[PDB]
Amino acid sequence: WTVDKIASALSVLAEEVPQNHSRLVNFLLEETEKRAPQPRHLSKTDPFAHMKSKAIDANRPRPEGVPTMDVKFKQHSGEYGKSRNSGRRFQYPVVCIKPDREPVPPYRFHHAEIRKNILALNSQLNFVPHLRDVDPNSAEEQKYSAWLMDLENLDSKSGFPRSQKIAKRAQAEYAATLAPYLEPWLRKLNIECTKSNLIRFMASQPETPQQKSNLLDTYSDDAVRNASMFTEAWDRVFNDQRRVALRDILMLDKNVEPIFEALMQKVIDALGSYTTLGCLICFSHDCEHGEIERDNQKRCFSLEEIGGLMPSLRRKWAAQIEQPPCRNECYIHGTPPWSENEVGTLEWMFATIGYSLRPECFVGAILRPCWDVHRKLQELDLRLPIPKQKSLPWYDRRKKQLMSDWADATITHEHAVRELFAPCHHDGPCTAANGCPCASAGTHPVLCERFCLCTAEECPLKFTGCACHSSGKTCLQRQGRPCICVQLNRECDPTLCKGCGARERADPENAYDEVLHSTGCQNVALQRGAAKAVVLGKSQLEACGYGLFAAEDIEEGEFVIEYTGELISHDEGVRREHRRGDVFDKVSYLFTLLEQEGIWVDAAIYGNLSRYINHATDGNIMPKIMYVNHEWRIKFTAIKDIKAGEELFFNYGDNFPNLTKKLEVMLPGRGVPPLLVPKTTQPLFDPLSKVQLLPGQPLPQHPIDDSWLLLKHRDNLQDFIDLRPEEKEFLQEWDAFILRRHISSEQYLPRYFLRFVREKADWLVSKRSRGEEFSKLVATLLARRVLPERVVIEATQVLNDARGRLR
Amino acid sequence: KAARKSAP
Amino acid sequence: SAEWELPRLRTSFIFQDDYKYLQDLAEFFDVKFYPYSPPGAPPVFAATSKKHAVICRLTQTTDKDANPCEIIQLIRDDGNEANCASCWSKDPITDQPLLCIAGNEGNVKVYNVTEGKLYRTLVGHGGGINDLATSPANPYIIASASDDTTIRIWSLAPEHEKQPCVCILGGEGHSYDLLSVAFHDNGRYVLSAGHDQVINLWALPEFPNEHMEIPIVIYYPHFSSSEIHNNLVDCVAFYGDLILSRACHEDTIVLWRIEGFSSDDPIPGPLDAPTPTDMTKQTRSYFTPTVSPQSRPAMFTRLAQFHTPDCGVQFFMRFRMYHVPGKHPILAFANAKSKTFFWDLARFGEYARFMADLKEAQQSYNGRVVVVDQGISLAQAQQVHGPGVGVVMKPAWLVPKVSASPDPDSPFGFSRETLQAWADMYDLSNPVGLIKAHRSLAIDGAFVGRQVGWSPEGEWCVVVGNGNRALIYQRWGKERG
Ligand SMILES: Nc1ncnc2c1ncn2[C@@H]1O[C@H](CSCC[C@H](N)C(=O)O)[C@@H](O)[C@H]1O
Ligand SMILES: [Zn+2]
Ligand SMILES: [Zn+2]
Ligand SMILES: [Zn+2]
Ligand SMILES: [Zn+2]
Ligand SMILES: [Zn+2]
Ligand SMILES: [Zn+2]
Ligand SMILES: [Zn+2]
Ligand SMILES: [Zn+2]
Structure with a gap:
């Protein structure tokens, strides 16, 4: 063999390509022709039979009253379609049909409802x-x-050329066509040349490392390597200056493309996927929290954002030292080879249970009798490894009160000027001297929040909830002592605001418990999620499309609705607005959420009926940005008493110019400067069908459908190369369940965890890898101190009961 | 250069 | 006989300008033959101008000078909008023909044509409507493609009268104005395309035979691609399970297939649909086959390209296939420079068979091959030339001007020029090759083709376009010399 000889031989083999292609296309045409369908739904008679030509001769006078249209006919004959004569003109009476329905007010895209803001990717x-x-x-x-x-x-x-895109697409198709031929051809030539040998040669040829390192790590370098000769011959035949180098095919190959304190280190390595992706806010591994970089890489709002497992796990152990047997042959009769993964399970459980509930019972329930894991635990001999600060003059965390020049001493309440930084996770005090971002990253300090690793006892910036307690309504926009939460433009914390009682009232399961909400916390409206009854209609403002109308009476001070949509950057907003623009001729659904940070909410496609609230300088509702459990959200509050049937309006603000109707840096958008169909002169619409509504009829209220959104999150997990199939499987199952709960508070996690364990009991015990992956989740949640011991004890009983029933 | 819907 | 016969121009008409007071503004944007008449009934088509619906009947004549075209109905849309879209349906109670017309106002007007009345209006779209298609499985199901970037599926059945929108094809599948919508023969798959250069295949669920308070919303297509064409797509159709599509600036009609797509397989559910997880992937499919040497297997295969020269920068030009059991499948399209093109798809197969036999005989008989026309038997031809000579039967339609004849006066094979001319029209070996039309007819004047229509029995082909002109091609005529 030589290059010349291989190339000559590949030229003969390449003749198979157009031959097989013609066989494929021809076979497909013939199968299609054979399977032609019979005409269906034919009428019994000719419906046109009784209808005569309406033609009036050109020579006749035009009919009186009725409109007439001319048609000129030409007759043709021969091979070249020559006209037989100049033609004949005829007059036809016209049947004039006036349309009787106006179209609905205009719109672009299908407007779908979302329960909460969704995170978007940057687009091109x-x-x-x-x-x-x-x-x-x-x-x-x-x-x-x-x-x-x-x-x-x-x-x-x-930060993400036509001629190249056209060339690349054409090359990608030609590479897909030739890829199935390489191995049959290599076998036919029988050169002592294999695909592995050709991938090895490519990796040992310019031109990026460590990508070439990763390939050689799995492939190695291994007699006479005439992979070079085949490569040259291939390039001579298929890469002529539809072309493709052997490299382009090999790079798309299935065996190429995807390849592009000891106890504690084992535990850190084992829990990696859970600590890197597990959301601190909603507990899902693919969610609406986190940040999207310019290249669409995502920084999850996870344990990694706050220093990983160890800073949080060390603090848990300290908090432990400063403070019934199982139904599975408990260690109580104490003290089959254990696989690596089984040893690991006991390891991460032992570590995260810490200086406590015992790992034995749980490991047994996940894996084995409780005594078996007790003696292996003893065989393995596993072992676990305040500088008084002055109170701030502007904030008292014991009394839960703001004082002095606090409005100038902090920017905690001034969301429009806030830049976001990861919660603090340093060892020493929360000061500018010790590099704490809460204390120093902004123009003024901000309070340390629930995810900051410091505690209320040691840290003077630590937020500790409000002091509010009343047999009546409390945490009001105007109170004895005022509500710190209301003053800081935030909703009450279901955990931190004890006895107001945000615990019950921020719980969505109590949303329509009217007796409960008549007393207690009045500062959890976004969490409660009980919006006022509203109805889509045609706006009273002249040529102003849709508007939103009240479908019940709303009293001044009441929460109306939240502005939801896609969370986008200022730059993505500019791209979107310009793409949807018309240089020859207006409608925007942007809302600035965090001005300084550059976070906008776009409701052009996903949002709710609040996207239709029109502008009026003298509105009857008022938007406000609120901090809600480390989520920034837009709520609307009534600023007048509004009656059922009245149109809702708000002042869009200073950054939306040409809004005259009454009665790259510049980004226009809104900014903060039996239910029946109500009686109104205005046409009212069903938001989905766009059918008109009749006043006095039941108000349509369609439950939100988020299955499309759950699908997107499941698929995002599935496309990760970094995740192992066993992890993808568990994480997808946990997230499908937890995403539906729209959690933003740890207060409700134990209840939902128990419901997950009870529902997935059978699925979990059925496959060994599911239980393993499940224990990794529990370990991450215990390390975080979010999951109480009592629910882990209960999960042991639910799991032990699940198997055995399975026998 | 630019696409056209109407007849020329 | 005459199964190989291709159409010839028989009649043409210019319908009076109806838009000059509201580029030369008057156009016939659509033409549709009535599909529900009994077998053998005179064919009827509706040609849609910006303001009118011209309803014609075609009758075969024995007189070359006689007019086969008669206008039996002429309706004026007395609104202040320009129309461009039509499809036929039937009254669910009387079975009378219903003509649906849509345009830039964004409403579907449904006309009772025999009585000259408005039957109903379908209101709901947020922008102009560019295309309409009736389901082949249910005559009461209509799809509309709009500038609002969505497809609405409507039912004219009595049970859906109060709320006729059964389905919305929304989400983020499309990002710009839709130009084309087409149904599969099974009525469960829908193809959509437009300005965003994306071609989407959607799976429709079964619609309940009762009142639907809301339409079923579909967020994701089961197959999505912006990779078949490099420009806006203005015409999409199924050809059995295969796909036909054209884009602006390309001068081709692309025949391609979705890999792993078979209409014999169960219809996938909404949550089987792929989602756009990676923004760098411009093709995604639920159908993708699992066996391939590629890590991400190919999701579609370009099969062939019909050469459609001189379309230039023009868009909103539609092609049409005649596809009926027992007759040859014929593709027709008119360009932006006064030509009508025809391809008889059954020619491809006979040519392929003839060249395979010719290639086999050349190798087996060292080029000693005699070709004889079909219409003398193979067996009797073999006796004439002896055992040393290979005999190949050639289709009679394949007319002269694999290796070429050694010299011009050789008794074996054909000239390079003959073989090249045939390959231009019939060779299907190259996916990026250009298939020359089997018939190309010149049109007098300056004409831009907008739409093509075939009669149920395929004896008539109507091409409509600019200046409100209609061109009527015929085959298997009754004209006497
Ligand atoms: N007071 C006002 N004057 C003029 N245009 C207004 C207005 N309030 C709202 N708009 C219009 O409404 C847009 C905001 S979106 C609000 C819903 C919208 N009317 C719709 O039919 O979908 C603005 O971009 C502007 O086009
Ligand atoms: Zn989250
Ligand atoms: Zn136990
Ligand atoms: Zn700190
Ligand atoms: Zn702190
Ligand atoms: Zn902090
Ligand atoms: Zn309070
Ligand atoms: Zn509070
Ligand atoms: Zn409170």
Whole structure:
């Protein structure tokens, strides 16, 4: 063999490609032709039979009153379609049909409802937005081509060429066509040349390491390597200056492309996926929290964001030292080879249970009798490894009160100027001297929150909830002692605000428990989620499309609705607004959430009926940005008594200019500066069907459908190369369940965990890997001190009962 | 250059 | 006989300008033959201008000078909107023909054509409607494609009268104005395409035979791609399970297939649909086959490209296939420079069979191959030339001007020029090759084709376009010389 000889031989083998292609296409045409369908739904008679030609001769006078239209007919004959004569013109009477229904007010995209704000990815323009026809070499052609150029200038500026995209697409198709031929051809040639040998040669050839390192790590370098000769011959035949180098095929190959204190280190390594992805807020591994980088890489709001497992696990152990037997042959008759994964299970459980509930019973329930794990635990001989600060003059965490020049001493309540930083996770005090971001990252200190690793006893910036307690209504926008939470523009914490009682009232299961909400906490409206009854209609403002109308009486001070949508950056907002624009001729659904941070809410597609509230400087509702369990949210509050049937309005603010109807940096958007269909002169619509509503009829209220959203989160997990199939399986199952609960507080985690354990009892005990992955979750939640011991004891009973029933 | 819907 | 016969121009008409007071503005954007008449009934089509619906009947004549086209109905939409879309349905009670017309106002007007009345209006879209298609499995099911970027599925059945929108194809599948919508023969799959250059395949659920307070909303297509074309897509159709589509600036009609797609397989549910997880993947599919040497197997295969020269920068030009059991499948399309093209798809197979036999005989007989036309038997031809000579039967339609004849006067094989000419029209070996039309007819004047229509028996092909012009092609005519 030589290059010349291989190339000559590949040229003959390559003849199979157009031969097989023609066989495929022809076979497909013939199968389609054979399976042609019989016409269906044919009428018994010709419905047109009784209808005569309406033609009136050209020579006749035109009919009186009725409109007439001319048609000129030509007859043709021969091979070249020559006209038989100049033609004949006829007059036809016209049947004039007036439309009787107006269209609904205009819109773009399908408007779907979301219960909560959803996180969006950054996007690129992948097409040519056609607006109208433009005459060649005109002012309009120039205006249009300048707008397209501006759009292209935003994508280059985003951080993410036509001729190359066309060439690449054409090369990708030709690579897919040739890839099934490589191995049959290599066998036919029988050169002492295999795909593995050709991948090895490619890896040992320029041109990026450590990607080439990763490949050689699995492939190695291994007599006479004439992989070079085959590679050259292939490039001579298939990569002519539809072309493809052997490299391009090999890079897309299934065996190539995807390859692009000891106890504690084992535990850290074992829990990696859970600590890296597990959300501190909602407990899901793919959710609406976290940050999206310019390249669409995601930084989850996880344990990793706060230093990983160890800083949190060490603090738990300290908090422990400063403070019934199981129904599975408990260690009580104390003291089959144990696999590596079984040893590991006992290890991460032992570590996270800490200086406590015993790991034995739980490990036995996940894996084995309780005594078996007790003696292995003794065989393995496993072992576990306040500088008084002055109170701030502007804040008292014991009394839960703000004082002095506090409005100037902090920016905790000034969400518009806040920049987001990871919760603090350092050892020493929370000061500028010790690099604490809560104390020093902003223009003024902000309070330390629930995820900061410091505690209320040692830290003077630690938020400790409000002191409010009343047999009547409390945590009011105007109170004896005022509500610190209301003053800081935040909702009450179900855990920190004890006895107000945000615990019961921020619980969605009590949303419509009217007797409960008549007393206690009045500062959990977003968490409660009970919006006022509203109805879509046509706005009273002239040529102003849709508007939102009250469908019940709303008293001044009442929560109306939340503004939901997609969470996007300022830059994504600019890209979106410009792509949807028209340089030759208005509607925006943007809302600034966090001005300084650059977080906007876009309700163009996903949101709720609040996206339809029109502008009025003198509105009857008022938006406000609230901090709600480390989520920033927009709520609307009534600023007048509103009657059922009245249109809702709010002042959009200073950053939305041309709103005159009454009665790259510049981004316009809103900013903070038996239920029946109600009686109104205005047409009212069902939000989905767009059918009109009749006043006096039941108000349509469709439950939110989030199965499409749960699907997206499941699929996001499935596409991770970093996750192992056994992990994907458990994480997808846990998230499908937990995402539905819309959790933002640890207070409700134990109840939902128990319900998960009770429901998935059978699924979990059925496969050894599920129980293993489940124990890793429990370990991460215990390390975080979020999961109480009592629920882990209960889960042991539920799991031990699940198997055995399975026998 | 630009696409056209109407007849020329 | 005459199964190989292709159409010839028989009639043409110009319908009076109806838009000049509201680029030359008047166009016939659509043409649709009535599909529910009994077998053998005179074919009827509706041609839709910006303001009118022209309903014609075609009758075969024995007189070359006689007019086969008669206008039996002429309706004016007395609104202040331009129409561009139509499809046929039937009254669920009387079985009378219903003509649906839609345009830039965003409403579907449903006309009782025999009586000249408005039967009903379908209201709900947020922008102009660009295309309509009736389901082949249910005549009461209509899909509309709109500038609002969604597809609405409507039912004219009495049980859905109060709320006729049964389904909305929404989510983020499309991001710009939709130009084309098409149903599979089974009525469960829908193809959509437009300005965003994405071609989406959606799976429709079964619609209950009762009042639906809300339509069923579909968030994800089961197959999605913006990779078949590099430009806006203005025409999409199924051809059995295969797909036909055209884009602007390409001068082709692309025949392709979704890998792993079979309409014999159970219909996937909404949650089987892939989601756009990676923004860098411009193709996604639920159908993808699991066996391939590629890590991410190919999700579609370009099969062939019908050459459609001189479309230039023009868009909103639609092609149409004649696909009926017992007759040859014929593709028709008119370009932006006064030509009508025809392809007889059954020619491909006979040509392929003839060239396979010709290639086999050349190798087995060292080029000693005599070709004889079909219409003399193979057996009797073999006796004439002897055992040393290979005999190949050639289709009679394959007319002269695999290796070529050694010299011009050789008794074996064909000239390079003959073989090249045939390959241009019939060779299907190259997915990025250009298939020359089997018939190309010149049109007098300047004409841009908008839509093509075939009669149930395929004897008529109507092409409509600019200046409100209709071109009527015929085959298997009764004209006497
Ligand atoms: N007071 C006002 N004057 C003029 N336009 C207004 C307005 N209030 C709202 N708008 C219009 O409504 C848009 C905000 S979206 C609100 C819903 C919208 N009317 C719809 O039909 O979908 C603005 O971009 C503007 O086009
Ligand atoms: Zn989360
Ligand atoms: Zn025990
Ligand atoms: Zn700190
Ligand atoms: Zn602190
Ligand atoms: Zn802190
Ligand atoms: Zn309070
Ligand atoms: Zn509080
Ligand atoms: Zn409270």
